[PDB]
């Protein structure tokens, strides 16, 4: 809470190596002002992708909500930073999270008429859907479920096939 203020300011400004320095010297990667804004928020809002990667690598909370219920992903979607969005999604940002305006990163993408962003977001949603869909197989055991889950997280782009397999097995193990 002193090195932290300089971290917020260096993230806002866009000064890379200054941040790598601040980090190496052990500054709190999850510091916030009176509006619950963390350095990841500032670096997402202001379009600095390198600094996002650094902060993320140092373990910044990727689903941090500020005073308006807004997440780094929301703030990245507000300006159309495709590059940032993608890595934010790799570190496990919740694409369906809502804020005080009832906005989803998707809804925002629809506001700005951004179709590329929209298809990134959209294709991300099907995968979480596959997860939740696998979870509601009533004729599986915890071993099968977990196996399918771990297989999913090892390779998200296989989601659909994985789901297929699950259903096949599900109706194969139908009771009595």
Residue numbers in the entry: 12 to 135, 1218 to 1269
The authors write:
Here we propose a novel method for connecting the pre-existing α-helices of two proteins into a single extended helix using a chemical cross linker. EY-CBS (3,3′-ethyne-1,2-diylbis-{6-[(chloroacetyl)amino]benzenesulfonic acid}) is a chemical cross linker that can react simultaneously with two cysteines in the i and i+11 positions of the α-helix19. To test whether EY-CBS detects the formation of a helix, we chose two amino acid residues separated by 11 amino acids in the proposed fusion helix and mutated them to cysteines. In conclusion, we have developed a new method that can convert two pre-existing α-helices into one long extended helix.
We determined the crystal structure of the unreacted 3,311 fusion protein at 2.8 angstrom resolution to understand why it reacts strongly with EY-CBS. MBP was not included in the crystallized protein solution. The crystal structure showed that the protein A and ankyrin domains were connected by a slightly bent helix. When the structures of the fusion helix with and without the bound EY-CBS were superimposed, the fusion helix was seen to be bent by ∼20 degrees with respect to that of the EY-CBS-bound helix. The asymmetric unit of the crystal contains 12 fusion proteins that can be divided into two groups, each group containing 6 proteins. However, the proteins belonging to different groups are in completely different crystal environments. Despite this, the proteins in the different groups have almost identical structures, with a Cα root mean square difference value of 0.32 angstrom. Furthermore, the simulated annealing omit map calculated using the refined protein structure showed a clear density near the fusion helix. Because of these, we conclude that formation of the fusion helix is unlikely to be a crystallization artifact. Crystal structure of the unreacted 3,311 clearly explains why the 3,311 fusion protein is strongly reactive with EY-CBS: the fusion helix is already present before EY-CBS is bound; after the covalent reaction with EY-CBS the fusion helix resembles more closely the ideal helix because the distance between the two cysteines is forced to be 16.8 angstrom.
